[PDB]
Amino acid sequence: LICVNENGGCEQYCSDHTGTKRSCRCHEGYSLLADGVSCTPTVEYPCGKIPILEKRN
Protein backbone atom coordinates (compact mmCIF):
# COMPACT_ATOMS: atom_id res chain seq x y z
CA LEU A 1 0.00 0.00 0.00
CA ILE A 2 1.03 3.62 -0.62
CA CYS A 3 -0.24 6.83 0.98
CA VAL A 4 -1.01 8.67 -2.28
CA ASN A 5 -3.61 6.02 -3.23
CA GLU A 6 -6.76 5.94 -1.05
CA ASN A 7 -4.77 7.51 1.82
CA GLY A 8 -2.92 4.18 2.14
CA GLY A 9 -6.06 2.78 3.76
CA CYS A 10 -5.50 5.04 6.80
CA GLU A 11 -8.33 6.87 8.53
CA GLN A 12 -6.02 9.85 9.26
CA TYR A 13 -2.28 10.28 8.58
CA CYS A 14 -0.03 7.99 6.52
CA SER A 15 3.78 7.51 6.22
CA ASP A 16 5.56 5.48 3.52
CA HIS A 17 8.56 3.44 4.67
CA THR A 18 11.40 1.78 2.78
CA GLY A 19 10.07 -1.28 0.94
CA THR A 20 6.31 -1.97 0.59
CA LYS A 21 5.82 -0.69 4.17
CA ARG A 22 3.24 1.82 5.42
CA SER A 23 2.48 3.24 8.88
CA CYS A 24 -0.77 5.00 9.72
CA ARG A 25 -0.88 7.56 12.50
CA CYS A 26 -3.52 9.53 14.40
CA HIS A 27 -3.83 13.10 15.64
CA GLU A 28 -3.30 13.93 19.31
CA GLY A 29 -6.40 12.85 21.25
CA TYR A 30 -6.73 9.64 19.22
CA SER A 31 -5.08 6.20 19.28
CA LEU A 32 -4.52 3.73 16.43
CA LEU A 33 -6.46 0.45 16.59
CA ALA A 34 -4.94 -2.99 16.04
CA ASP A 35 -6.21 -2.96 12.43
CA GLY A 36 -3.38 -0.45 11.85
CA VAL A 37 -5.65 2.05 10.06
CA SER A 38 -8.50 3.19 12.36
CA CYS A 39 -8.30 5.99 14.93
CA THR A 40 -10.38 6.09 18.13
CA PRO A 41 -10.74 9.08 20.50
CA THR A 42 -8.82 8.92 23.80
CA VAL A 43 -10.22 12.19 25.21
CA GLU A 44 -13.67 13.72 25.74
CA TYR A 45 -13.28 16.49 23.12
CA PRO A 46 -11.06 15.26 20.30
CA CYS A 47 -10.41 17.66 17.41
CA GLY A 48 -12.69 17.64 14.40
CA LYS A 49 -15.68 15.94 16.04
CA ILE A 50 -18.97 17.61 16.94
CA PRO A 51 -20.12 16.53 20.43
CA ILE A 52 -23.86 17.16 19.99
CA LEU A 53 -23.87 15.01 16.82
CA GLU A 54 -21.58 12.30 18.28
CA LYS A 55 -24.03 12.01 21.19
CA ARG A 56 -26.93 12.22 18.71
CA ASN A 57 -25.81 8.76 17.50
Partner: protein, 250 residues
Amino acid sequence: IVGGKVCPKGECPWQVLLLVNGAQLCGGTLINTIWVVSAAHCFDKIKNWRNLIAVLGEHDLSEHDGDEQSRRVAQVIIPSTYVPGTTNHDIALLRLHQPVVLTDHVVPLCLPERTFSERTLAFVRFSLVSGWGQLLDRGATALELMVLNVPRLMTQDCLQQSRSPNITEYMFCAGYSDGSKDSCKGDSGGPHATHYRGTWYLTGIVSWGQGCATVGHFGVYTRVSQYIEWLQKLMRSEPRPGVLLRAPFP
Protein backbone atom coordinates in the same frame (compact mmCIF):
# COMPACT_ATOMS: atom_id res chain seq x y z
CA ILE B 1 -22.10 34.28 4.37
CA VAL B 2 -24.35 34.67 1.29
CA GLY B 3 -26.84 31.93 0.44
CA GLY B 4 -26.14 29.63 3.39
CA LYS B 5 -28.11 28.63 6.47
CA VAL B 6 -27.90 29.12 10.22
CA CYS B 7 -25.32 26.75 11.70
CA PRO B 8 -27.28 24.94 14.42
CA LYS B 9 -25.84 25.95 17.80
CA GLY B 10 -22.87 23.73 18.67
CA GLU B 11 -22.39 22.34 15.14
CA CYS B 12 -19.55 24.75 14.30
CA PRO B 13 -17.74 24.45 17.67
CA TRP B 14 -14.30 25.55 16.37
CA GLN B 15 -15.59 28.88 15.02
CA VAL B 16 -14.03 31.97 16.63
CA LEU B 17 -15.34 35.54 16.67
CA LEU B 18 -12.67 38.25 16.82
CA LEU B 19 -13.61 41.61 18.35
CA VAL B 20 -11.76 44.92 18.53
CA ASN B 21 -13.13 47.34 21.15
CA GLY B 22 -16.27 45.17 21.28
CA ALA B 23 -16.93 45.45 17.52
CA GLN B 24 -16.92 42.52 15.09
CA LEU B 25 -13.60 42.28 13.21
CA CYS B 26 -13.28 38.82 11.69
CA GLY B 27 -13.61 35.08 12.24
CA GLY B 28 -11.04 32.46 13.11
CA THR B 29 -10.60 28.75 13.77
CA LEU B 30 -9.66 27.12 17.09
CA ILE B 31 -7.01 24.41 16.48
CA ASN B 32 -6.15 23.64 20.11
CA THR B 33 -6.92 25.21 23.50
CA ILE B 34 -4.66 28.28 23.10
CA TRP B 35 -4.18 28.65 19.32
CA VAL B 36 -6.47 30.25 16.72
CA VAL B 37 -5.89 30.51 12.96
CA SER B 38 -7.23 33.61 11.16
CA ALA B 39 -6.39 35.86 8.16
CA ALA B 40 -3.45 38.30 8.17
CA HIS B 41 -5.50 41.00 6.43
CA CYS B 42 -7.84 41.23 9.44
CA PHE B 43 -5.05 43.05 11.32
CA ASP B 44 -4.04 45.69 8.74
CA LYS B 45 -5.73 48.60 10.58
CA ILE B 46 -5.31 47.60 14.23
CA LYS B 47 -4.09 50.53 16.31
CA ASN B 48 -4.33 49.20 19.86
CA TRP B 49 -3.29 45.56 19.72
CA ARG B 50 -4.29 45.17 23.38
CA ASN B 51 -8.06 45.51 22.73
CA LEU B 52 -8.34 42.35 20.60
CA ILE B 53 -10.64 39.65 22.00
CA ALA B 54 -11.41 36.12 20.80
CA VAL B 55 -14.79 34.57 21.61
CA LEU B 56 -15.39 30.82 21.54
CA GLY B 57 -18.77 29.10 21.87
CA GLU B 58 -20.58 32.02 20.25
CA HIS B 59 -23.75 31.55 18.27
CA ASP B 60 -26.32 34.35 18.66
CA LEU B 61 -24.77 37.82 19.01
CA SER B 62 -27.97 39.27 20.54
CA GLU B 63 -27.93 37.13 23.70
CA HIS B 64 -25.62 35.65 26.29
CA ASP B 65 -26.42 31.99 27.00
CA GLY B 66 -23.39 31.05 29.11
CA ASP B 67 -21.55 28.91 26.54
CA GLU B 68 -19.43 31.85 25.32
CA GLN B 69 -15.79 32.04 26.43
CA SER B 70 -13.82 35.25 25.85
CA ARG B 71 -10.03 35.51 25.85
CA ARG B 72 -7.49 38.24 25.27
CA VAL B 73 -5.21 37.73 22.29
CA ALA B 74 -1.59 37.59 23.56
CA GLN B 75 0.18 37.19 20.19
CA VAL B 76 -0.72 37.74 16.53
CA ILE B 77 1.84 36.03 14.28
CA ILE B 78 1.97 36.87 10.58
CA PRO B 79 4.31 35.49 7.90
CA SER B 80 7.17 37.74 6.72
CA THR B 81 5.92 37.32 3.14
CA TYR B 82 2.52 38.96 3.79
CA VAL B 83 2.25 42.57 2.59
CA PRO B 84 -0.54 44.68 4.12
CA GLY B 85 -3.28 45.65 1.64
CA THR B 86 -2.56 42.71 -0.70
CA THR B 87 -3.85 39.13 -1.05
CA ASN B 88 -0.98 36.62 -0.84
CA HIS B 89 0.05 34.76 2.34
CA ASP B 90 -3.20 35.66 4.09
CA ILE B 91 -2.78 33.79 7.36
CA ALA B 92 -2.31 34.69 11.06
CA LEU B 93 -1.69 32.50 14.10
CA LEU B 94 -3.11 33.88 17.36
CA ARG B 95 -2.05 32.85 20.86
CA LEU B 96 -4.75 33.26 23.51
CA HIS B 97 -3.74 34.68 26.91
CA GLN B 98 -5.35 31.72 28.68
CA PRO B 99 -6.61 28.44 27.26
CA VAL B 100 -10.28 28.02 26.47
CA VAL B 101 -12.03 25.12 28.19
CA LEU B 102 -13.25 22.46 25.83
CA THR B 103 -16.98 21.78 26.08
CA ASP B 104 -19.83 20.54 23.87
CA HIS B 105 -19.79 24.06 22.38
CA VAL B 106 -16.02 24.67 22.17
CA VAL B 107 -13.89 22.11 20.27
CA PRO B 108 -10.78 22.54 18.09
CA LEU B 109 -10.68 21.74 14.37
CA CYS B 110 -7.88 19.34 13.44
CA LEU B 111 -4.86 20.94 11.75
CA PRO B 112 -3.92 18.18 9.28
CA GLU B 113 -0.49 16.96 8.25
CA ARG B 114 0.66 18.51 4.98
CA THR B 115 0.87 15.23 3.05
CA PHE B 116 -2.63 14.17 4.11
CA SER B 117 -4.03 17.58 3.23
CA GLU B 118 -2.36 17.70 -0.20
CA ARG B 119 -2.89 14.05 -1.18
CA THR B 120 -6.36 13.46 0.26
CA LEU B 121 -8.21 16.48 1.64
CA ALA B 122 -7.50 18.60 -1.46
CA PHE B 123 -9.65 16.18 -3.49
CA VAL B 124 -12.70 16.24 -1.24
CA ARG B 125 -15.07 18.30 -3.37
CA PHE B 126 -17.26 20.08 -0.79
CA SER B 127 -16.29 21.85 2.43
CA LEU B 128 -18.01 24.15 4.95
CA VAL B 129 -17.32 27.87 5.34
CA SER B 130 -18.86 29.83 8.21
CA GLY B 131 -19.14 33.22 9.91
CA TRP B 132 -21.17 36.22 11.06
CA GLY B 133 -20.36 38.21 7.92
CA GLN B 134 -22.61 39.97 5.45
CA LEU B 135 -25.70 38.03 4.34
CA LEU B 136 -25.71 39.92 1.04
CA ASP B 137 -23.22 42.03 -0.85
CA ARG B 138 -23.62 45.59 0.52
CA GLY B 139 -25.92 44.13 3.20
CA ALA B 140 -26.14 43.77 6.98
CA THR B 141 -24.11 41.17 8.89
CA ALA B 142 -25.61 38.06 10.52
CA LEU B 143 -26.74 37.87 14.17
CA GLU B 144 -26.61 34.03 14.14
CA LEU B 145 -23.66 31.98 12.90
CA MET B 146 -24.12 31.00 9.25
CA VAL B 147 -22.64 28.08 7.32
CA LEU B 148 -22.32 27.27 3.59
CA ASN B 149 -21.21 24.18 1.65
CA VAL B 150 -18.86 25.14 -1.21
CA PRO B 151 -17.11 23.04 -3.88
CA ARG B 152 -13.35 23.44 -4.45
CA LEU B 153 -11.84 24.10 -7.89
CA MET B 154 -8.38 23.34 -9.26
CA THR B 155 -6.80 26.74 -9.91
CA GLN B 156 -6.47 26.14 -13.68
CA ASP B 157 -10.24 25.50 -13.73
CA CYS B 158 -10.98 28.55 -11.55
CA LEU B 159 -9.11 30.80 -14.00
CA GLN B 160 -10.84 29.21 -17.02
CA GLN B 161 -14.29 29.44 -15.39
CA SER B 162 -13.84 33.03 -14.08
CA ARG B 163 -14.97 36.10 -16.05
CA SER B 164 -7.24 41.57 -10.62
CA PRO B 165 -4.95 39.62 -8.25
CA ASN B 166 -3.29 36.34 -9.27
CA ILE B 167 -4.44 33.06 -7.72
CA THR B 168 -1.13 31.88 -6.27
CA GLU B 169 0.04 28.49 -4.97
CA TYR B 170 -0.87 29.79 -1.48
CA MET B 171 -4.57 30.08 -2.41
CA PHE B 172 -7.42 28.04 -3.81
CA CYS B 173 -10.86 28.83 -5.26
CA ALA B 174 -14.14 27.50 -3.93
CA GLY B 175 -17.81 28.32 -4.39
CA TYR B 176 -20.07 29.32 -7.27
CA SER B 177 -19.94 31.73 -10.21
CA ASP B 178 -23.73 32.32 -10.48
CA GLY B 179 -23.85 34.97 -7.72
CA SER B 180 -25.93 32.89 -5.27
CA LYS B 181 -23.48 31.63 -2.65
CA ASP B 182 -20.18 32.89 -1.20
CA SER B 183 -18.37 33.88 1.97
CA CYS B 184 -18.11 37.67 2.43
CA LYS B 185 -16.12 40.50 4.03
CA GLY B 186 -17.01 39.89 7.69
CA ASP B 187 -16.37 36.13 7.40
CA SER B 188 -12.64 36.77 6.77
CA GLY B 189 -10.37 34.55 8.85
CA GLY B 190 -13.05 31.91 9.36
CA PRO B 191 -12.72 28.21 8.64
CA HIS B 192 -12.97 26.30 5.40
CA ALA B 193 -13.44 22.86 7.00
CA THR B 194 -13.23 19.53 5.17
CA HIS B 195 -14.70 16.20 6.30
CA TYR B 196 -12.82 12.92 5.85
CA ARG B 197 -13.87 9.57 7.35
CA GLY B 198 -15.73 11.00 10.34
CA THR B 199 -13.42 13.89 11.27
CA TRP B 200 -13.17 17.54 10.18
CA TYR B 201 -9.93 19.28 9.18
CA LEU B 202 -8.78 22.86 8.48
CA THR B 203 -8.09 23.25 4.76
CA GLY B 204 -8.68 26.97 4.10
CA ILE B 205 -9.18 30.44 5.55
CA VAL B 206 -11.81 32.88 4.21
CA SER B 207 -9.52 35.38 2.44
CA TRP B 208 -10.72 37.37 -0.59
CA GLY B 209 -12.58 37.67 -3.88
CA GLN B 210 -14.20 40.21 -6.20
CA GLY B 211 -16.95 41.55 -3.93
CA CYS B 212 -19.25 38.88 -2.47
CA ALA B 213 -21.17 36.41 -4.64
CA THR B 214 -20.28 38.40 -7.77
CA VAL B 215 -21.38 36.69 -10.97
CA GLY B 216 -18.41 35.18 -12.83
CA HIS B 217 -16.19 34.95 -9.73
CA PHE B 218 -15.40 32.46 -6.98
CA GLY B 219 -14.31 32.88 -3.37
CA VAL B 220 -10.56 32.68 -2.76
CA TYR B 221 -9.20 30.93 0.33
CA THR B 222 -5.75 30.66 1.91
CA ARG B 223 -4.30 27.21 1.16
CA VAL B 224 -3.54 26.10 4.71
CA SER B 225 -1.56 23.02 3.58
CA GLN B 226 1.32 25.37 2.58
CA TYR B 227 1.61 26.60 6.19
CA ILE B 228 1.39 23.43 8.32
CA GLU B 229 5.10 23.27 9.18
CA TRP B 230 5.24 27.06 9.75
CA LEU B 231 2.30 26.84 12.17
CA GLN B 232 3.58 23.77 14.00
CA LYS B 233 6.99 25.35 14.58
CA LEU B 234 5.42 28.50 16.00
CA MET B 235 3.16 26.53 18.35
CA ARG B 236 6.31 24.96 19.90
CA SER B 237 7.86 28.41 20.43
CA GLU B 238 7.88 30.55 23.57
CA PRO B 239 5.83 33.77 23.57
CA ARG B 240 7.61 37.08 22.91
CA PRO B 241 6.88 40.54 24.35
CA GLY B 242 4.62 42.64 22.10
CA VAL B 243 1.46 41.30 20.47
CA LEU B 244 2.40 41.48 16.78
CA LEU B 245 5.15 39.10 15.63
CA ARG B 246 6.30 38.80 12.04
CA ALA B 247 7.81 35.34 11.57
CA PRO B 248 9.94 34.16 8.65
CA PHE B 249 8.19 32.17 5.95
CA PRO B 250 8.97 29.47 4.94
